Amino acid sequence: AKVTELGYLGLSVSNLDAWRDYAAGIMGMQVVDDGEDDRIYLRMDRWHHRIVLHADGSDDLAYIGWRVAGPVELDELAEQLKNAGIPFEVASDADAAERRVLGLVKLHDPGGNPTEIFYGPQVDTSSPFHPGRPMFGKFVTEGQGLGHIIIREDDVEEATRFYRLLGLEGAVEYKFAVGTPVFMHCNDRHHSLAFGVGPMDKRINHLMIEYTHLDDLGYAHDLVRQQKIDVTLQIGKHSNDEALTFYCANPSGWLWEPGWGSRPAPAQQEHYLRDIFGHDNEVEGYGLDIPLKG
Amino acid sequence: MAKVTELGYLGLSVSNLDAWRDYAAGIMGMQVVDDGEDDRIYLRMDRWHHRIVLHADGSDDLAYIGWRVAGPVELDELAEQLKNAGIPFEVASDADAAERRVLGLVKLHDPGGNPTEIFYGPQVDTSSPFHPGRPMFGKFVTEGQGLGHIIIREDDVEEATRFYRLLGLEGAVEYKFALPNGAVGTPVFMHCNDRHHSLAFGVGPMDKRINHLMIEYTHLDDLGYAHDLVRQQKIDVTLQIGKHSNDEALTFYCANPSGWLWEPGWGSRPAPAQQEHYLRDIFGHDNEVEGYGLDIPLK
Amino acid sequence: MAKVTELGYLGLSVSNLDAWRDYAAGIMGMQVVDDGEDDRIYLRMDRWHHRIVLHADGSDDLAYIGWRVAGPVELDELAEQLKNAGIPFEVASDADAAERRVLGLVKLHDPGGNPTEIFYGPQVDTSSPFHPGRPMFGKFVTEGQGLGHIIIREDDVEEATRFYRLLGLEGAVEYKFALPNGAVGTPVFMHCNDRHHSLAFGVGPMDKRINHLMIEYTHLDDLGYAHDLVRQQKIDVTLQIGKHSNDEALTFYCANPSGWLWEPGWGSRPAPAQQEHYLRDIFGHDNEVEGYGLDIPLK
Amino acid sequence: MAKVTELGYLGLSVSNLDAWRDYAAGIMGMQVVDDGEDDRIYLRMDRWHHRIVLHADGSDDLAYIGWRVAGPVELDELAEQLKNAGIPFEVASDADAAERRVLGLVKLHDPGGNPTEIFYGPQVDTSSPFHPGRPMFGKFVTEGQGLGHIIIREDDVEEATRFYRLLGLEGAVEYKFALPNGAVGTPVFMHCNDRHHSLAFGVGPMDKRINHLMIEYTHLDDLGYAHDLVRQQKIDVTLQIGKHSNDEALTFYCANPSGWLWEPGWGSRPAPAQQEHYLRDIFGHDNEVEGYGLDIPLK
Amino acid sequence: MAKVTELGYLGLSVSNLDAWRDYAAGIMGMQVVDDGEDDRIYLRMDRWHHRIVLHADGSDDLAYIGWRVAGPVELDELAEQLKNAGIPFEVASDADAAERRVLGLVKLHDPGGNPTEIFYGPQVDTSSPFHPGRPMFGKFVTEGQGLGHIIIREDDVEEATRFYRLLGLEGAVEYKFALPNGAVGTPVFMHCNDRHHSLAFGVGPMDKRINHLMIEYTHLDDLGYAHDLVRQQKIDVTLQIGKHSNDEALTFYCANPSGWLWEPGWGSRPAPAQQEHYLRDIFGHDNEVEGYGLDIPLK
Amino acid sequence: AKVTELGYLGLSVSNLDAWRDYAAGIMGMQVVDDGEDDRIYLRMDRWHHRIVLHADGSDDLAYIGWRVAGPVELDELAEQLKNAGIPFEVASDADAAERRVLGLVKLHDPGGNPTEIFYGPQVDTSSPFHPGRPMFGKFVTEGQGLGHIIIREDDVEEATRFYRLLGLEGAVEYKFAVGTPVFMHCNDRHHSLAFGVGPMDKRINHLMIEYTHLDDLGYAHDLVRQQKIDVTLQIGKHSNDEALTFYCANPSGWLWEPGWGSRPAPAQQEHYLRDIFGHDNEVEGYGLDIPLKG
Numbered sequence A, F: 001a002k003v004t005e006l007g008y009l010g011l012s013v014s015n016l017d018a019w020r021d022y023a024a025g026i027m028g029m030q031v032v033d034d035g036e037d038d039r040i041y042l043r044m045d046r047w048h049h050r051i052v053l054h055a056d057g058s059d060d061l062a063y064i065g066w067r068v069a070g071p072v073e074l075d076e077l078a079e080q081l082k083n084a085g086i087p088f089e090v091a092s093d094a095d096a097a098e099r100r101v102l103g104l105v106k107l108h109d110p111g112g113n114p115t116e117i118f119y120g121p122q123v124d125t126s127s128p129f130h131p132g133r134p135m136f137g138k139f140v141t142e143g144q145g146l147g148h149i150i151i152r153e154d155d156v157e158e159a160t161r162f163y164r165l166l167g168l169e170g171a172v173e174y175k176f177a178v179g180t181p182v183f184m185h186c187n188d189r190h191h192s193l194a195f196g197v198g199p200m201d202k203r204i205n206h207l208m209i210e211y212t213h214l215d216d217l218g219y220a221h222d223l224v225r226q227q228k229i230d231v232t233l234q235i236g237k238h239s240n241d242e243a244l245t246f247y248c249a250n251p252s253g254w255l256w257e258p259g260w261g262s263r264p265a266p267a268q269q270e271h272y273l274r275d276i277f278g279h280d281n282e283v284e285g286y287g288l289d290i291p292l293k294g
Numbered sequence B, C, D, E: 001m002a003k004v005t006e007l008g009y010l011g012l013s014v015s016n017l018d019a020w021r022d023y024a025a026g027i028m029g030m031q032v033v034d035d036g037e038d039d040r041i042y043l044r045m046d047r048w049h050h051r052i053v054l055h056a057d058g059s060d061d062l063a064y065i066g067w068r069v070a071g072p073v074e075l076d077e078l079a080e081q082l083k084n085a086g087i088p089f090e091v092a093s094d095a096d097a098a099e100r101r102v103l104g105l106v107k108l109h110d111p112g113g114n115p116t117e118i119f120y121g122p123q124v125d126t127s128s129p130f131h132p133g134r135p136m137f138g139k140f141v142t143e144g145q146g147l148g149h150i151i152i153r154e155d156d157v158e159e160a161t162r163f164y165r166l167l168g169l170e171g172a173v174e175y176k177f178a179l180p181n182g183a184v185g186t187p188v189f190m191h192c193n194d195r196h197h198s199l200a201f202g203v204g205p206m207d208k209r210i211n212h213l214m215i216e217y218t219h220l221d222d223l224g225y226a227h228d229l230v231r232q233q234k235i236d237v238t239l240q241i242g243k244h245s246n247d248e249a250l251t252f253y254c255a256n257p258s259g260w261l262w263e264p265g266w267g268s269r270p271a272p273a274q275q276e277h278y279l280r281d282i283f284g285h286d287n288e289v290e291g292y293g294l295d296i297p298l299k
């Protein structure tokens, strides 16, 4: 049994209103507020949510939620964790209910990042996805999770082994001292996870979100520029995912990467030396201060 | 040769703008578009700037019907056909065209006295994507099919049929109903594209220019959503959910803020290549709230 | 320009209604439709109210042939073509049209004296789905292809060909057979849609207006079912199962209650885009019970 | 309006029937058909009774070219076009048509004096399937494309082009070659269906009515089989395997028993929608055995 | 009836051949073709010998526009239409046609005085496959769509529209822009195939015959490659990457060696079946380096 | 875990310039020169290279590179090798980097042919394949490797067993003393490997390369004839792969077989007695001096 997608993220944020303006107003996510005094939700599709924003006063990643197919698969993964000697907690019904899931296992990755494994997310079919700004299309999420993340790992090799145990597959995909970032996938999304990208001052570097329609990316890009939000890498294409993407600052001081047209991960491992086109460095200091093309 | 290609727009006279916004956007899912005109707003269903203009003039009826042609050459040909038939028409100026948000325009009347417009080059607001007035599972069916269809008043069914044939619509009688006096009601339905029909008439006496407008969702769940809302808001349903034998669409008929009917629907089939007629509907469409001009027994 | 689009219906004169029900429904799978008319019943093959009218008048022959056109404009054009050719015709009233269960109708005769009708707008009973008179694996092939095809009497093959070309059918000679006196039999086959042919003639002397009617099943197993029943009920088979080289359909020819032939079939190919002719059949169609006008050696 | 639809057949005058059987059946894979006529046999390539008639008359050239039309109405229209152009023609009797194994026929000559026939209704022998004169991996390409294509003698290229345009073929110059005197050779190629061309001319002086016939296999391996046999039997190859830039077909050119050329091929592309021209071939087609009228340098 | 089928070629007057090679091949990916002519070279984009002729004559503007028709019959018909409209034209000789590398040619001028050519039978160099002047991920989009599109000078928009309609192009106004004096700019766009447009004009005052040429890549990555190079080589970009609402193509506008604009692009949609108009672009196309005649605010 | 393709070849050559003229100028490969004093590269697709030419002064095969999906699969194959008792070396990072791969195992086949197993080839997406002469199309390589090779085996049965362990599948496909050549596949390419073809005076007999477009083969064939390069077998079709191919000499004195339209290997083993058509013997002495048709 393997994890099947990157189901949700929990984020600790200092400014909820700024996040609504950003994630809804620009990116097109739907804000969902169920009356909880300490959190709101960002929705991207049928699921009740893909992102939880905790009114916490911090500005980093809080937890990463990996999906499995069902209770049997969860138990099998948990049995594997026990076998390998990795500490985990079987969460209570009320903890599962908090995350809007039926079953939950809580643990950590070798870099100490809070990691949860779940099945049975809450799906709000009866209330159709309604975007925070006008959208030409939708988000790419069905069977692919909410997007992908680059996270902090002090031991790249331990992290690779850990995620392989969860069922992710991948290896080093770039050679840039040589920087050799590792990219991993668990479904049709080129990668759900990456790490080993040099020094990070937060647990998360970026989250990439994917539009179905190129025009929604153009819409988002125009707005980011109109609102003078920092762009760290201009519109371009990485050699690995071949997606058209840009990297811009979010209210928490790390990066979101709106994009379009990502390909599936190759059946067999490849590596690259540089990006295809674009991705010119602009505003430095967000952890992506490397020449991606040369 | 040149023919009308779709029912492009409707201009409506309304007495209450606030109720219409609540109704057309809040229930039906249309997008309200306000360009700051002191006397009008618009309802948008797709890429086009609008499909419906609401004129806040205090009346509650149809103001004008806009039929689309492919281009200026086609308009010119149609106008020439009108001139040959001795049908009076107005060639709109650039300011008249700009008003309707079109490139070129001809204004006239059908035989029933319904203001009729023929135009090309709708304004399309590609840059600001359609954003529904309530959450939607899908979209509206409009592309190459126009906004929907309408039943309108015709005192002379045959003259109306001849007129619309000249415009390029095709059709004939699709139903035969038994009337009280031993006469037969024989409503005419006409099409100019893949939409089963864009136009119907000959349903008997009407106190308004328009009986109903039918609008179509791509997704069944949007019909369910709209139906649940109509029922919740205690809005009159004249005909319950069902299917006519002609379009085979799943639809209901309900009151709008102007006292006539809208018919939200789903799954409309294309017009058959060859003329057919029917004596009844397939299922549902049971009569409920009476007095909207569709009190006839459909089964 | 306007052309007949399919063989829509046949009116038949019969002497025994009870035997025809047993035969057409009980064996063939057609649906019996009785509207309470004292002198007639109907056989239904699909969505249409009927494809065949049985007139219980005591005769046993064809009464009329109904050819479909797309609509009233097309009918009008065809009528104009008849008037130009100096062919006499009757424009049916609304009551005449209602009788045939159509919207509009023209009545005339072909050159062989066969009563011929041209109509638009068949009554379709969508609300009560086709329900076969015996269990069926599939359905009949009719959609855009009419009820099947017929071989009819023509004393003048060339005049008949010219007449039917005017109607919009296309075709020519498809077989050449050697006759006893050194002459050649050259039957003409004609089509107006995807059905290989709707009409054939020039098969020589006939004592009735009609030689056969061919009906087509969607599913081979329905042909097998019907064939097994015909054999069980000891009904005369004039030509055993086989295939003509023209339509390439798997068919047999058997007696009906009126003493002429029905040809149940399956897998009929479309008419070739360009004219072809043949000297024999592919396989089977061996002569069995003689005296039904098809005693010719097909191989 | 009406146009020729394919190159249907060729009649050939031959001096040696035995060698032609050995060649066309034994190497090429055609089916020999002998109906017991004392003076002729046939070569069959598909469902049709034949594509080629061999007249054992002692000459070694083309006897006649048969172009197909869809039917008798189309023939009539073409004949009317010939009469309007003041082109003399013969309307064949039923016995003349029977000879060619067709339903209707018109006989005339092209401007180069090549006997030209226009016909409808080929005899198709569906009942006895095509059986090749040597084992075949596949079949011939003929359906809706005729037997292949031919290069024929024309003393007046422009008159020939005008004549064939009247017949309904389309085309123009497809190559420009540099000639010794500073002139340019500009061969014309023409098509009437999906076959890149059915006809070409203007290749300069010819001592026979026909330069070559091209025949196409469905399967590459049949070309390989035929090529291996030609080489084994020491039959002259004038142009080795290669590809012309126009049809992009993989072909070679070899001698037949009458001293002219057959061009077995595979993978012919359809004629481009719009006229193109070329200055050379793609690959191969290197000159080998000279003196068959194609000694020109193709690259 | 007969119509132009694509924008086939452009002849350009240039002052610097070396810079144009560097630009069109080294950046854009076109193939340089040098046939040893002392005064000209060619740029190739596909199978055709060339799409663009560069005349090293010291000027820096458009020299001629070549529109394609399907064949000699179509050319003849178009010429007849020009003669009927009282439009003067030159029927090119075989040497004139050979110069342009075509089979037949007509030379004239549009109402703006732009030299306009109508031709059939381009020379296609199938034997030497397209080999780009820089490494390419894909190819150019040209097949049945011509080389791209152009904006050209027209002092009389209406006369220009009428002229091009006669040629067989279709279109009308696609944008309305607000001008400083309260007037409206209304550029006309026209198409003759699946390319959204081949031609546009009415963008106001121009100091050259041509404002821009748009060329389309099959693969997005080639646009990225070309864009990266333009930026690296410090070549002026007048409009940044973006999308017009009409063609919905992803494009940028940059300077060429002659001081006018090329617009490399990707993902152009087909022209809508029916006329549409817009008030702004979708995204990007922000004004950068000014003074190339496109300083207008597109959003 | 199985090998997935014949990823690359290393060739020892005496004349680099003659190889550029031949492989680029005629065949359409792309020459890649990264400044190494002792080697250049032949490229056929997205990959940095498919062939390495070592300026060595020899004229034979140097090494055969077999691809696996990733590091896990490499380790599993290596564990299988250890189990069967076959000697192998886990190559250093710098050895892996030399071959432009992420991970490498070096060994030999039973015939002593140098054999490498790898994952993660260098892919140069940003610099599109640009052919050494004009091409109508491209090479068939995606998921099929660079082509196929016939190599020297003194023990056919041991070689068959060895390659089965690597994951190749096949058996004798021809019966021509009876010559019974063995053909083996690991993907959609009819075969990647063959052996048991009689006496060989080099380690490699031929390499077959496949064009997508028939016209590129005609182009190559014309040039081979124009340049008077020895053709040993004329244009023809083998019964097994049913590809249209010819066999011609290369600057190293063995053979390249340009071809088109190869079919996939049958699901089930077949054998043949002769070729379909063509392949007539021409210039003898290249190790293919047999009557293939009779």
Ligand SMILES: Cc1cccc(O)c1O
Residues within 6 Å of the ligand: A174, A194, A238, A240, A241, A288
């Ligand atoms: C930031 C970054 C750099 C290189 C490759 C990637 O996939 C990526 O996300």
Ligand SMILES: Cc1cccc(O)c1O
Residues within 6 Å of the ligand: F174, F194, F238, F240, F241, F288
């Ligand atoms: C040389 C050779 C001979 C026979 C079969 C083959 O596949 C082959 O490559």
Ligand SMILES: [Fe+3]
Residues within 6 Å of the ligand: A148, A206, A208, A257
């Ligand atoms: Fe990323």
Ligand SMILES: [Fe+3]
Residues within 6 Å of the ligand: B149, B212, B214, B263
């Ligand atoms: Fe309705």
Ligand SMILES: [Fe+3]
Residues within 6 Å of the ligand: C149, C212, C214, C263
């Ligand atoms: Fe029959």
Ligand SMILES: [Fe+3]
Residues within 6 Å of the ligand: D149, D212, D214, D263
């Ligand atoms: Fe030829």
Ligand SMILES: [Fe+3]
Residues within 6 Å of the ligand: E149, E212, E214, E263
């Ligand atoms: Fe443009």
Ligand SMILES: [Fe+3]
Residues within 6 Å of the ligand: F148, F206, F208, F257
């Ligand atoms: Fe081989």
